Amino acid sequence: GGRGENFMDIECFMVLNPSQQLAIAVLSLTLGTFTVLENLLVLCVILHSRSLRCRPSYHFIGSLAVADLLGSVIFVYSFIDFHVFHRKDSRNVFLFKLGGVTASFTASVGSLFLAAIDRYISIHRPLAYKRIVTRPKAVVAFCLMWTIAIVIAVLPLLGWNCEKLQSVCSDIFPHIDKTYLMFWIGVVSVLLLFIVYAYMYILWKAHSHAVAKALIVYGSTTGNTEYTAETIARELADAGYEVDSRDAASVEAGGLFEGFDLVLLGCSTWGDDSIELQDDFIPLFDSLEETGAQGRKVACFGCGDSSWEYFCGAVDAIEEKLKNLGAEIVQDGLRIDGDPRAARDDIVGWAHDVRGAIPDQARMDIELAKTLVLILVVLIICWGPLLAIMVYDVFGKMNKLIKTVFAFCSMLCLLNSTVNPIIYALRSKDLRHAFRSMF
Numbered sequence: 001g002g003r004g005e006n007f008m009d010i011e012c013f014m015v016l017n018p019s020q021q022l023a024i025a026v027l028s029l030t031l032g033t034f035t036v037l038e039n040l041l042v043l044c045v046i047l048h049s050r051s052l053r054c055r056p057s058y059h060f061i062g063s064l065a066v067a068d069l070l071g072s073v074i075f076v077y078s079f080i081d082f083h084v085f086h087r088k089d090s091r092n093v094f095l096f097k098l099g100g101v102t103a104s105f106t107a108s109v110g111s112l113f114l115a116a117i118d119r120y121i122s123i124h125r126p127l128a129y130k131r132i133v134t135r136p137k138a139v140v141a142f143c144l145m146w147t148i149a150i151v152i153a154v155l156p157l158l159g160w161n162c163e164k165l166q167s168v169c170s171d172i173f174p175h176i177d178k179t180y181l182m183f184w185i186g187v188v189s190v191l192l193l194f195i196v197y198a199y200m201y202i203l204w205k206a207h208s209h210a211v212a213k214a215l216i217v218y219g220s221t222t223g224n225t226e227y228t229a230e231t232i233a234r235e236l237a238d239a240g241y242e243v244d245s246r247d248a249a250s251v252e253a254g255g256l257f258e259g260f261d262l263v264l265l266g267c268s269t270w271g272d273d274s275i276e277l278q279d280d281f282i283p284l285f286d287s288l289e290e291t292g293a294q295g296r297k298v299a300c301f302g303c304g305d306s307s308w309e310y311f312c313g314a315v316d317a318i319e320e321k322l323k324n325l326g327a328e329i330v331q332d333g334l335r336i337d338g339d340p341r342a343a344r345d346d347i348v349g350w351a352h353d354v355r356g357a358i359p360d361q362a363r364m365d366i367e368l369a370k371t372l373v374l375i376l377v378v379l380i381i382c383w384g385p386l387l388a389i390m391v392y393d394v395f396g397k398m399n400k401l402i403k404t405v406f407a408f409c410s411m412l413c414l415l416n417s418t419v420n421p422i423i424y425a426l427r428s429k430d431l432r433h434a435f436r437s438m439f
């Protein structure tokens with residue numbers, strides 16, 4: 001060529017111009033540069049803090065984030081190198097760009113593979129897991145994995161080709177050998193098929209010991225016990241519980257506590273002359289034996305005022321019935337005098353003591369399993385469609401329609417690298433603190 005065989009030179013069927021050309025250009029460039037910076041931000045907090053670069057779990061995030069960065073950098077580079085300067089790509093300069101993107105996804109799948117192995121060791125060798133998967137072990141596994149990932153990108157650059165082999169070309173990518181894609185597609189397809197199976201088994205094994213779901217049922221008229229429950233809700237949410245907070249007026253007692261292994265009942269006391277539970281709680285209290293409390297871990301809280309004869313008599317009545325039902329009361333009830341906002345240190349302190357009802361390792365294994373499946377599903381949603389396009393290319397021919405959706409499916413591949421740093425921020429509670437360490 002000619003017009004040039006250039007990276008990001010797609011068929012570009014244009015419904016509207018030049019607003020599309022102008023607006024999509026700025027939009028796509030801004031999206032790309034945002035990714036490079038936000039994945040550069042993830043790379044920073046990890047290398048910056050020692051409490052994380054010694055963890056084997058952050059050798060997994062850092063690997064993903066530098067894979068996301070390798071691709072987002074190639075995106076912005078090739079976008080500004082062609083849509084702004086209109087420069088031409090030779091054979092090697094083209095394959096290097098494409099190989100970089102290919103390497104970014106390879107290492108991403110390779111990282112999810114190593115994570116599955118770590119979880120398999122945690123499942124099969126829970127006792128000695130800490131001494132098996134160590135910082136020097138994790139570095140070697142990831143360094144090896146990247147060299148295997150890089151090698152595949154360079155293989156096309158180096159040997160496999162249309163030009164060098166005079167082989168059948170790919171209808172999507174210039175210079176690319178069709179039989180190389182079969183090898184590439186098959187390798188990642190097998191790995192992903194295993195990772196999908198593994199991540200399901202990992203998550204299933206993580207629920208065999210414990211689920212990490214807390215239930216909070218509160219009865220409140222003024223809102224003091226609602227504020228108390230919402231405060232307890234966020235402390236348990238940070239500590240790795242899937243917290244479900246419900247007003248007593250909206251629940252049915254039958255089988256209420258099923259599926260939860262921590263249940264926190266809160267109720268205010270309204271003894272005008274006697275002792276009475278908050279009215280929305282009474283229906284639950286009267287049918288409490290239907291909830292499934294026997295053997296379950298529970299604890300009570302409630303707002304009251306000491307100038308009444310029976311200070312927080314409601315939590316007394318609930319705890320006594322929970323004892324009579326064979327519930328496992330984890331600790332003594334929280335009794336808040338006066339305004340709960342003026343006693344927040346106790347509410348948070350109590351929630352911290354209740355937190356230990358389920359061991360840290362069980363909750364941590366569940367959020368690790370939950371986090372991995374989210375990374376995986378996002379990766380299948382974004383990169384999946386593009387892979388399906390490449391499958392259409394190798395076996396049979398393309399279609400005019402598949403060449404058009406490819407322009408938008410390839411943009412899905414980019415926003416996978418943008419939401420992964422967002423996923424790390426929402427689930428890795430330690431990364432948030434390391435971030436705030438640098439203000």
Ligand SMILES: Cc1cc2nc3c(=O)[nH]c(=O)nc-3n(C[C@H](O)[C@H](O)[C@H](O)COP(=O)(O)O)c2cc1C
Nearest residue numbers: 220221222223224225268271303304305308311312
């Ligand atoms: C009519 C009335 C009766 C009350 N009786 C008691 C009581 O017997 N024992 C107690 O500890 N507090 C009693 N209180 C105080 C409430 O429990 C207190 O106002 C509580 O903070 C309100 O809870 P809530 O806003 O979450 O519904 C009573 C308050 C009122 C207005």
